[model samples]
Target: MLEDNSSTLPPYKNDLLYERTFDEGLCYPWHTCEDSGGKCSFDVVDVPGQPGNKAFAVTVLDKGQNRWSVQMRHRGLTLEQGHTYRVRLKIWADASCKVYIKIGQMGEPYAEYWNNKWSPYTLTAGKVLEIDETFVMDKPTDDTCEFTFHLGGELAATPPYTVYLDDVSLYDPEYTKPVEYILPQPDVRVNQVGYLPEGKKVATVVCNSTQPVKWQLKNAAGVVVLEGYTEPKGLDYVHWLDFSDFATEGIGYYFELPTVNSPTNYSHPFDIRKD
Candidate 1:
């Protein structure tokens, strides 16, 4: 185990980008570019939620036909291999829209180091969207690399809209850990409000086992009303079981999986209604 020095060290140190928060106005290192079909203006304005604090704003007259037609670039960055770094910022727009954020080389092959083009964030009008992405640099880069936000193309918002950015920071954390997004899973998924007696009766078994497992349908009296094998869906670690043949309409019905080992591997109580 490592010592907990988090309390002693400052949260952020050695910011890589200069003139963060645009307090000094849109000066050196930060600039906006537009293609022939794209027209836009960049300025420094007060941050939305913080009075007296400044931010960078871009108002577009045309979004252009290509994604890179209108973009904001911050130059003079050197990234090294094996360094753990983070990029955080606050973004919002006057109208709902999407913007591509990326960091990569400024010229030549234009190799990308990090980007969110595949999974872009959809910004809500006037609502700030906070983004925090951390990763370990796999390769070294010179000061030619540029941090960019692609705000053009057909996918971006239409012309005559403004996008606001504030509190942008990039720094090395020195130490890093992978963040895991673990979603709480239910043992099974069934219609909790009950199922129609004449309708197709099906329940989803949530498990990792690819092989067929034994599942049972129990009635109110704790008796197995029906039994069947699960049909694997081939993905998402789930299986589907059908019991549409059982026409008995009653209450206090639930599904149970005995082959899968887990205490909570039972569905919530439901009912079978004829209506």
Candidate 2:
């Protein structure tokens, strides 16, 4: 299982990514505040707002009759058909709160897919919440992804109700290759490379490979940051190089095996991001 901390920022940033947000009039269909017990709230100004701030930020309200609810429409998520992805989040609430991640077809109202419920999941405090689920894209549709956070019913009256969700990730098993390099794929041996702090770049050539393998790392600008060679040895070996001199924020780095003489060989690329 891969953790959600691999990405530079939480996979889902601030309850929304590209084309995702809970606001009034634009994405949300609701009235003014004081309606629906002040259920409607939103973030109008373009500033980073804290989660669970009681300033009516990021909420929807119906001002006409004090009846309101919050919702949003997100588009452009290229979901694969018959593939499984996990939706995870960390929610902090009193004993009487329940939060939900609503997923449905794009441009459709919340009520349309409101009743589509998956397995029950838990949100433990101070820990990353994970939900392993599969999505069946029955029909080929483009830009048909939407999600929303709902807090009401048992969850409405809870005080100190703040949900800090991080590490939202989508894992594709098909994209992940099996551990064929080692015997017993499920029990494959993995070497532990000590934690390298942010802004540090490191490289290690596989000493166990029977063939010569060249290693290289390049930043987003195509600048070579690190390079090395893998010695022909039956046992796995590692070479670590520090790249703090070239590491920078908002940059992507990936390792490459220029030539792989061996049949069963693969390299995993890791990003410089923290949990």
Candidate 3:
């Protein structure tokens, strides 16, 4: 990880070069693979008004496969030693799929999930369903510091279910956002960064072009960490794309709107401090 906390914070068009967005598609860290008789696969496909990539499509087959780690990249991550966390998720399915969610230091699919203390978090086809709940880490020695949430609580009778998820968020409910955004270079013009006291915050992106575009975020080392697209009002106007679930993962992040004039729209990497 790029561990600089000061000068490492990047800026918009550092010496200038490019601009990109994940509007085309997205990716998750690890894939689910268990012998629960069900098979799961993930992909990035085209969506209405968005192409080249849109959202992650997850299809489960044969039954017995459910749980998404998601590998979130920005904002309010890492369950501090004694903090309470609220995990939320919004998703859509081709059809209704029976599912539930739980969080903890998980191994693979089908972990003991707090000794099977999961709720019936279901997803409706064509409709957006959300999962909201709270939990805490009381021990300096939690089940594991890398606590994650699992989504296959009660198992499913219906196989061959495909779902698309977005805005998966986790944060310490007790903290608050620093009232002032504390922009590094107020004159930068395009993007601005705010300091969140607790690290869990939200950002409103300004898409000056209404051509329905895709945006991208690359980490310090030029690694594509998160990429997603959103729909504008469908005219030569402005649009706002917000990933309310994440903002600063206590790490360095950089972004751009590479869909319109991508090759010229770019920014440098920046940071979020825990201290």
Candidate 4:
């Protein structure tokens, strides 16, 4: 049975976790599972180009007797058997979807753990949905345990349905402290000192917070190439980030903190090549 101490959990940190604008496909703004080929493989369809259409839509696949899943790395308390922990996320789904929480393992069918079922948080045409659920750690696991969110079964079939997720979190019953995000920040900086023929190796930093913060990386064209928050640190206060995927040649990029609820303020634009 789950314990009742909802008030003890800290307020959701919207900044630490990455927010999806749905400009890309169904991919989460940050942090893709290994099974997804380093990118979110979910299906997105009929994205709105105007006001009347649905903002964005996603299709969760069952993988045919398999489970389609997305996992976020977080630094939180270890999952101890019999100890109660709460897993919560704000999700608004146009069609019925079930949210599942998986620990320690990756790519396993979420249905294996029937007790961790999360009721679908329905989404209205223009309204947001918030869903929260608590669960007891019935499986024995150590600090290496990770958490995942799954939306599928009947939920995956309904095409044109959109789901918006934000403010994902986990907490212990005692309410000492909560850990929310697991991936490191993706912001990169290139200084004059470090330059390569192609371009300087981009430097990445992690931002720790619970509220939403805007991350901007722009090119010489004044076009914003990279934007998103650093994922919250997990149990190790450690996060991983890599910018090799987006490295480009001869382009100037800068970092900006449009939002800051933490001590670290925004940085001004910096050169990516030797000046």
Best candidate, lDDT-wise?
Answer: 1
**Cα displacement (Å) at residue 185, model 4:** 17
The CA lDDT at 13 in model 4 is 36
lDDT of 1 by residue, 128-224 (tens): 8987878777877555788888888864776798888877777675633334554564677776676556444667787868888889889988899
For each candidate in turn, the TM-score is 0.56, 0.37, 0.45, 0.39
Positional deviation of 264 in candidate 1, in angstroms?
72
Residue 167's lDDT in candidate 4: 41
Worst 10 residues of 4 by lDDT: 1-10
> How accurate locally is residue 249 in candidate 4, as Cα lDDT from 0 to 100?
50
Ranking by TM-score: 1, 3, 4, 2
Model 3 C-alpha lDDT per residue in residues 1-275, reported as the tens digit of each score: 11111111222122110111223232434134444444567665544543222455666665543343222122112344567655554566777765544444444432332222655555666777765666666645344333232334244436566766543444454544334444442111122343332222223334456465676766666777677775453332434444434545545566667666434455444554433
Per-residue CA lDDT of model 2 for 1-275, tens digit only, reads 11111223333332223311221102222112232343444432222353311111233222122112333223445455555444443333323334555555545442323212642234453334544454544544334655554453333433333433322333444434223353322111111221223222333445444565576666566666677654443344443333444434433555555564444333343455432
The candidate that achieves the highest TM-score relative to the unseen native structure:
1
Give the range where candidate 1 is weakest over 10 consecutive residues by summed lDDT.
1-10
The residue ranges of model 2 lying beyond 4 angstroms of the native Cα positions read 1-75, 80-95, 110-129, 139-142, 172-275
Question: Candidate 3 overall Cα lDDT vs. reference?
Answer: 0.44
Candidate 2 vs. truth: CA RMSD? 12.6
**Taking the candidates one at a time, how many backbone clashes does each contain?**
0, 18, 23, 13
Number of the candidate with higher lDDT, 1 or 2: 1
Judge candidate 3 at residue 101 and give its lDDT. Answer: 43
Reference-based lDDT, residue 269, model 4: 44
Q: Candidate 1, clashing residue pairs?
A: none
- State the lDDT at 112 in candidate 3: 31
In model 3, which runs have C-alpha deviations exceeding 4 angstroms? Answer: 1-24, 46-53, 65-78, 108-117, 143-154, 173-275
All candidates: CA RMSD (Å): 18.2, 12.6, 13.7, 12.1
